[PDB]
Amino acid sequence: AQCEATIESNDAMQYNLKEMVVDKSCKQFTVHLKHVGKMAKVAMGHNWVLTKEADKQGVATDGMNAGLAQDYVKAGDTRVIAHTKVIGGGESDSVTFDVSKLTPGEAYAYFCSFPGHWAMQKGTLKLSN
Ligand SMILES: [Cu+2]
Numbered sequence: 001a002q003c004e005a006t007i008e009s010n011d012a013m014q015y016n017l018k019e020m021v022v023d024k025s026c027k028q029f030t031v032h033l034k035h036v037g038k039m040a041k042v043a044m045g046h047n048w049v050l051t052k053e054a055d056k057q058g059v060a061t062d063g064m065n066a067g068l069a070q071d072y073v074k075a076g077d078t079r080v081i082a083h084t085k086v087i088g089g090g091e092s093d094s095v096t097f098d099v100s101k102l103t104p105g106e107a108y109a110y111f112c113s114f115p116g117h118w119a120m121q122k123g124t125l126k127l128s129n
Contacts, residue, residue: 003099004030009046009112011037011089013121020110022099024129030096031110033084041088046112047071048084048095050125053109055079056118063113072113086114102127 003026008016022029033048045068051059062074071086082097102108104127112121 002026003028004032006032006034007048007123008034008036009048009121010035011039011044013044013046013112013117015048015112015121015123018123020123020125022102022125022127024104024127026099028096029099030094031082031084032092032094033087034092035087035089038089041086041091042068043088045086045088045114046117046121047073047086047093047114048110049073049113050081050083050097050108050110051079052081053107053124056109056111056122060111060113060118064115072115081108083113099127104128 059079063072066074073083081101082095084093084095087093108125111118
């Protein structure tokens with residue numbers, strides 16, 4: 001709603017939103033990730049990671065390599081515009097980020113970097129009015 005959105009992840013390694021639009025009057029945007037499945041975070045944990053579409057595989061590989069204690073995102077990875085924590089079934093997490101980190105026109109990729117999820121669990125984020 002307004003300068004925020006909610007996205008659901010389930011036990012099928014899917015996000016319910018394939019596209020998110022950040023309104024141009026927004027200086028901050030907030031994403032609330034909900035894991036509406038029942039599986040454990042070691043089994044089917046999920047997060048939400050935002051990168052320029054170019055850096056998606058790089059971030060997903062380094063992220064898989066950072067472990068669960070780093071929420072599968074390489075610590076201080078400059079390519080990650082924002083990310084939630086890794087959560088398990090029945091949980092939620094939120095992240096707010098600065099919209100000046102994004103450029104109009106330019107398309108961004110958001111995905112889940114939990115092992116093996118990036119390929120499938122993905123969507124596009126764009127800035128518009
Ligand atoms: Cu996932």
